[PDB]
Amino acid sequence: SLTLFHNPASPYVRKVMVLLHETGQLNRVALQASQLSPVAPDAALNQDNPLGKIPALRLDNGQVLYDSRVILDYLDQQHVGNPLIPRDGSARWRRLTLAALADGIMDASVLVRYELALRAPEKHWEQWLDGQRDKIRRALAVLEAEAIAELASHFDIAAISVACALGYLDFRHPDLEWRQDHPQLAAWYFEISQRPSMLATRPPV
Amino acid sequence: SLTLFHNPASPYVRKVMVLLHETGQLNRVALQASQLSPVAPDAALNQDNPLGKIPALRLDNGQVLYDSRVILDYLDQQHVGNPLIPRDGSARWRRLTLAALADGIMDASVLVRYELALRAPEKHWEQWLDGQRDKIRRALAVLEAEAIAELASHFDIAAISVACALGYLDFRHPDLEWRQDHPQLAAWYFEISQRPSMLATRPPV
Ligand SMILES: N[C@@H](CCC(=O)N[C@@H](CS)C(=O)NCC(=O)O)C(=O)O
Ligand SMILES: N[C@@H](CCC(=O)N[C@@H](CS)C(=O)NCC(=O)O)C(=O)O
């Protein structure tokens, strides 16, 4: 069986859990709880993923896969249902780019979170935090203007990644209030939030 | 033709340039110079990649691909030579994980660089910088202990990414002196550095 380094707050981990849920592969995966930060290492995790990040997936043979996008690609090839990542065609690079946009939202939102929650407030850099927040808002603007129809057509790699990014914004950055300027995205997000895979993977209250 | 948002210092960009060089696709690509930082946006770049990061690749039809790993996957499917990313088999996820390890080295080394070069020294956080440096050293240790033979067997996605990560360490973090503790990696790195694709893509003096 597989072992996934796991935390119920992480949206990168959540992408993997949603994909396992959608593809019916949860029964293959043991979760290994992990609490960590860049300034608070998890030594057991570090022995499997030297970068000290989750998710990391340990295979039946002991080999370890990371990061999330590599794990997602692996798991999508493990089941015989319709692939959640297009194998070829323009759809492949379109959906993978949308997923990368979602990852970029998570990257920025995690950097802001670490800064505001772990770094001494006297050492905060406001132009930095604002720079990160700007990436998030530019990204959301694009999804709203260019991606609504594509996201709706299939709950795949792109939809899962965006959905998880949005959930993390609600969870750790509710001050952004992303729904105001992005109604179509918000409406879609409420709808997919009702999927069993999303309900089952919400971050802790 | 294609348009690549480009800077000769960026190792993520360098991965794309090395792959184009190796696969003979340089004649398809116009470079669009970009200078940027998280606190100094490039407005032309932002219109193509909302995350405000390079590389970003604009296709013949106007569509934009990012980030680097998506661009690398696209370009590797564009030529008819031997693929630099394994299409299946255990080799696919092994080589993609090694590439992700290299990306993790770049991620940490770029975060440190921004902190030390752009953030007011009174606001530096030493436990943070040290946390990032630790990921780099743990990653290098792993390449040295587990990956030498694999990297040597093919100058592919994994080798290109690692090679570019190491070049950036020499360029922006020469104080790490990674060669001391990692002789086999160092010897391999000197050898592949002599490839025309590497010579042609070195960061500026
Ligand atoms: N590129 C990685 C990013 C994963 C990531 O940053 N995970 C966070 C948890 S949400 C983490 O492990 N933080 C620990 C650290 O950065 O040291 C991926 O896609 O999996
Ligand atoms: N995940 C991205 C990371 C690219 C990246 O961070 N590029 C740096 C240049 S080396 C950058 O664009 N910095 C501008 C910024 O972070 O705002 C990729 O793999 O392409």
Side-chain angles (χ1 to χ4, degrees), chain B:
Chain B
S1 73
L2 309 174
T3 298
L4 181 68
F5 286 84
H6 174 274
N7 177 279
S10 174
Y12 300 96
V13 171
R14 188 181 186 185
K15 296 189 294 180
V16 177
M17 298 299 287
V18 172
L19 187 137
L20 290 167
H21 203 290
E22 297 281 334
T23 58
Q25 294 190 82
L26 285 171
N27 63 350
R28 272 221 294 160
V29 176
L31 307 181
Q32 179 112 81
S34 181
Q35 296 97 34
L36 47 29
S37 89
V39 303
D42 176 332
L45 171 60
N46 294 358
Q47 294 184 329
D48 274 4
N49 180 5
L51 304 170
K53 297 195 177 186
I54 60 181
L57 184 73
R58 189 162 65 230
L59 307 184
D60 186 52
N61 59 26
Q63 176 171 342
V64 180
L65 307 187
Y66 48 88
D67 57 356
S68 62
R69 286 188 261 180
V70 182
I71 291 160
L72 292 163
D73 186 60
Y74 173 76
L75 293 165
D76 190 46
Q77 298 261 54
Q78 290 296 298
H79 65 101
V80 301
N82 286 325
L84 304 182
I85 303 167
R87 60 187 85 84
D88 48 71
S90 64
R92 177 176 176 83
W93 300 284
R94 177 53 173 166
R95 314 300 295 206
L96 282 185
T97 291
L98 288 181
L101 176 164
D103 287 352
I105 293 181
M106 294 177 207
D107 293 346
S109 76
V110 166
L111 278 185
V112 163
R113 165 71 183 174
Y114 286 159
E115 178 89 335
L116 293 181
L118 304 178
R119 189 181 281 237
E122 86 249 9
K123 280 173 172 178
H124 288 188
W125 182 10
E126 198 65 23
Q127 200 186 4
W128 174 264
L129 286 155
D130 281 325
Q132 297 299 321
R133 290 190 190 101
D134 283 350
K135 300 183 187 300
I136 297 169
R137 273 182 290 250
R138 280 198 308 268
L140 291 166
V142 169
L143 292 176
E144 178 73 15
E146 311 183 19
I148 300 303
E150 295 170 284
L151 292 178
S153 67
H154 194 201
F155 193 63
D156 68 350
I157 188 67
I160 292 172
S161 302
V162 169
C164 290
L166 295 180
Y168 186 79
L169 288 184
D170 285 347
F171 178 59
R172 292 294 200 221
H173 304 273
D175 52 289
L176 296 195
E177 299 190 4
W178 61 267
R179 285 175 183 74
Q180 283 165 7
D181 295 333
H182 313 105
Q184 276 184 297
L185 188 62
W188 167 82
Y189 178 75
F190 173 80
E191 227 67 41
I192 58 85
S193 285
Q194 311 316 310
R195 295 179 78 92
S197 63
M198 289 299 283
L199 292 176
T201 57
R202 297 184 323 266
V205 167

Side-chain angles (χ1 to χ4, degrees), chain A residues 173-185:
Chain A
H173 304 273
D175 52 289
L176 296 195
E177 299 190 4
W178 61 267
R179 285 175 183 74
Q180 283 165 7
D181 295 333
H182 313 105
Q184 276 184 297
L185 188 62

